[PDB]
Symmetry: C3
Subunit: 324 residues, 3 copies
Amino acid sequence: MKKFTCVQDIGDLKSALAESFEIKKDRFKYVELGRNKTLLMIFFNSSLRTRLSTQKAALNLGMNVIVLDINQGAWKLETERGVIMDGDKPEHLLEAIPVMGCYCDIIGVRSFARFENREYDYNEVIINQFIQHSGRPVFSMEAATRHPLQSFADLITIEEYKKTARPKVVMTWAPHPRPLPQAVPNSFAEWMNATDYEFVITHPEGYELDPKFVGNARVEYDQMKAFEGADFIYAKNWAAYTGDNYGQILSTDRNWTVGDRQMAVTNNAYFMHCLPVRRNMIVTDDVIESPQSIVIPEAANREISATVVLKRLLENLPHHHHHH
Amino acid sequence: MKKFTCVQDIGDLKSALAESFEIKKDRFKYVELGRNKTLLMIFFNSSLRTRLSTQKAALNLGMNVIVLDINQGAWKLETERGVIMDGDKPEHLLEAIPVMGCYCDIIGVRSFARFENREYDYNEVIINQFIQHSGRPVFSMEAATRHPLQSFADLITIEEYKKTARPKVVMTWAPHPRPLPQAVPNSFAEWMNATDYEFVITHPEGYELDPKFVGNARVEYDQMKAFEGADFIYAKNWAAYTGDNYGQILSTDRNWTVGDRQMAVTNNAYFMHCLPVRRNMIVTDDVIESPQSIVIPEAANREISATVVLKRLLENLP
Amino acid sequence: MKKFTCVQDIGDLKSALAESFEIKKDRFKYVELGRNKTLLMIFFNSSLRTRLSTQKAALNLGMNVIVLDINQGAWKLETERGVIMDGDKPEHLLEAIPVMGCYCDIIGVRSFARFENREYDYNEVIINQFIQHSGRPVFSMEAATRHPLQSFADLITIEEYKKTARPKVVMTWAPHPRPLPQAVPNSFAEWMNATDYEFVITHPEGYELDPKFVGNARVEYDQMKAFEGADFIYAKNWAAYTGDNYGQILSTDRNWTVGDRQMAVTNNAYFMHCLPVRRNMIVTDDVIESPQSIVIPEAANREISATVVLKRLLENLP
């Protein structure tokens, strides 16, 4: 593992999963692995959830942790050459990022989609600057178009609760009052496509995701049809992506809200959601509070996916270093 | 001990005190007790004193520490069923709090009195939500109506300095420009009631505290009379609690400001204050700088009460 | 070493430098030194560079670390006696600082020059309050008029890259859009004056630094003349200091911007800057991107100077 931004980085899912469950049962088995190794967690958009679970994971590995919160207004990086820097930006990319790599061994970066330009957002500018110039292994704490730590945790929980080898897993859109990134849905599809599960995506018209993420997944427009015989339901809202609707809410249709009506059609499926969840918009009180709701164990698994990811990066650190 | 929000949680005062003094002399004696145990400190009201002393205490026990700062607006939790949550609350209580409890072993919560509705403040909603839903032991880093880490430090201080078995301890109100919560005075009263000390409360008319907290204290409205023969003076301002004056300032009378006039009548009493303290409003420069002022050793003991509390909680984990 | 605010505090330079290169090659050699020791970092000005490098250093020594961020103006300690404290000042110096020292073993303080009153700034009020009242060794994470951690890192960097025993080191002013403090320039001169290097200061007329820092150093107003034969070029902008211009920008002359024109007359000199750096204002892309630019290794050395300082402060605790 040279970085952790997408499913490809984790390699064979089997050993990754083996490691996950070994750690779930013996949390500090690798507490000596990160001794005197330092993690730098950088948030360009405040978090409380990813902040806590990532920190706990690092501690499972005996690592030192340094957290930095940087507001958009404090991240003015000049990127071009020949610029007379007498304006806003007090620093150039070429000195600012490498210097941060000076004081740590691994960097976690949490970026975000600003929803003003699709190209820019999908270019994943912030995380790629750290990959390219920090001089350290970088893992994503959620980027503009993926959230691998979330997806990995989601995969761990399906493996944890599934009744068969190849469950039918359905990812469904649901309404939200705000325009949301397609980072979680993109990522979930990417990871599900990497498994042997029967994977289906249902969403209203106009909410199609990028083909590179959708891949060969069956896209069903009839939510009830898609839900039939499902073993797991993964609900998530996202703003539009294609055409000229990028970044916008095209619907707030609560008929998509996951309730007993759609769940009744499944094979008594488990209910999943990455959190935070707005009840009766994404899912009903009855469904999220039922015994098939595993949103809490799913959240607990965020500590595990982080712990395995950090373990892998720790195992991939170079043994020797440069000294002038 | 399953939580730490009031004096009752600490049980027998004698053994809690023996442990306090054992740790004062050998600070890192239990540094292994907390290895691979994670303390999550959550501040809903910013702080720096409790923040610093609590972290230092957890390190005394070798614990990992994670601090979260949540300001208002970042804590809108839905609590009702059947709500179409497309408003300002981004999540429900039944998801948010259990999730937080997933990544830690012990949780410290610092909540606060809002002052716009007494019933709500005294219901201690935020801290009770964490106790009921986190799945972890919870301790108060100051709540809306109690501050047991402070009172426990105050108790250790009085035992450390007392010149008699059952000293006369006097808690007195003093003027302040802002409306302050009843947390420290309620909590101090609650802890003094658990001792065998002679305890007196003195404050202007209208500033009475919840009988739930005043307990068996003798209330004396004449401050000079209350001070008579005192061995310890614990000064603290609080906004009104009773009637329709909840959360309001009824007085700013500096006759209550603790100076030599009142101290002269005590048995050369020690002077105590939880801090921060406004000089010449709460207490005079000469009093707070006199040999019997023990405000600093008292603040030092915040580290001790917190490590004894964290140690008791650690000893009670599954 | 009981404190670290200036070059005298480091003691013998050779020995401090020896420890620096030792730690550079064996970063965790003294990780047991700071076991159960707590460092309190206090920022009165938010930072990312100093915050990050100082925390890493403490970890190199196995220390516990607590970082406090205190908003400018949220820190108003009353210093006078007989003051009726019903204003904006929440507490008195005499209580506040000693209390913070109760919960830690070493304190790092990052203060700043407000540029409102020269004399107040040069009195280094904040760092001195901590030194005089906290009861703990204190080190500057950057003050109003010095930045010893930065200067020490710079010294390490020159020692690390020097091609000769006594290189010619030149500190040159360069233009900036805003009024910057003289802390870095004052400190670099202070440290260079302590070495046996050929040290030259070059700036526009009016940018003279306090003679307390310039001391016996050579000041050359002709930038090119100052540059010829140099082995190291240390660039930094600062606002005027002398007389009526304290804190003011007297020039933004891009003729001082360090580019190939000036570097050409040096003996292929290395280029240094403490960061952050405005390109084409302080130095051109070509110079800062050439192999003679050691701005990053210089920044890396901030970790090393802070580790040596913390190590020496630790070695001298009771």
